[PDB]
Amino acid sequence: VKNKCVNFNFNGLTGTGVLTESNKKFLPFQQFGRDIADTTDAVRDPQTLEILDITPCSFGGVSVITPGTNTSNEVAVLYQDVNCTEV
Amino acid sequence: LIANQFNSAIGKIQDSLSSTASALGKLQDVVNQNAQALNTLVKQLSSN
């Protein structure tokens, strides 16, 4: 499944992220890439010899805007640095 | 005269700023230090 948050397991390299088609050119002996943080950045599908990027699922802080319970109980929620389409 | 001296004085600020990127070393250091801080912070995740 592409372009969606899935729990993925490739040959035992487990993790959670969004699998997209990549433009990376793996060498024939390289099973998987990495980032500077030693987290997996790209994997080669063992059944379909293609290269997939892995993007961690969207997340962000949650900040509550409260006028003050002494005034109202109605609140407004701020999803920091996240597009409205994923909320 | 004081007018011309101030106007010309303003102009030289442009050139000193336009040519010398190190005129803004202080601010660049602030970003660089923080950039160093985070990168080191990120890299530790690779340590056993």
Binding site: A37, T39, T55, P56, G60, G61, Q80, D81 | L17, A21, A23, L24, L27, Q28, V31, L38, L41, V42, L45
Partner: peptide
């Protein structure tokens, strides 16, 4: 002249144009 692991950056309250005013 100046230039995914839980690490974010919050935006400043005042914006760059805001400062300019």
């Amino acid at each position: 002249k100046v230039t995914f692991n839980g690490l974010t950056v919050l935006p400043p309250l005042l914006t760059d144009e805001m400062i300019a005013q």
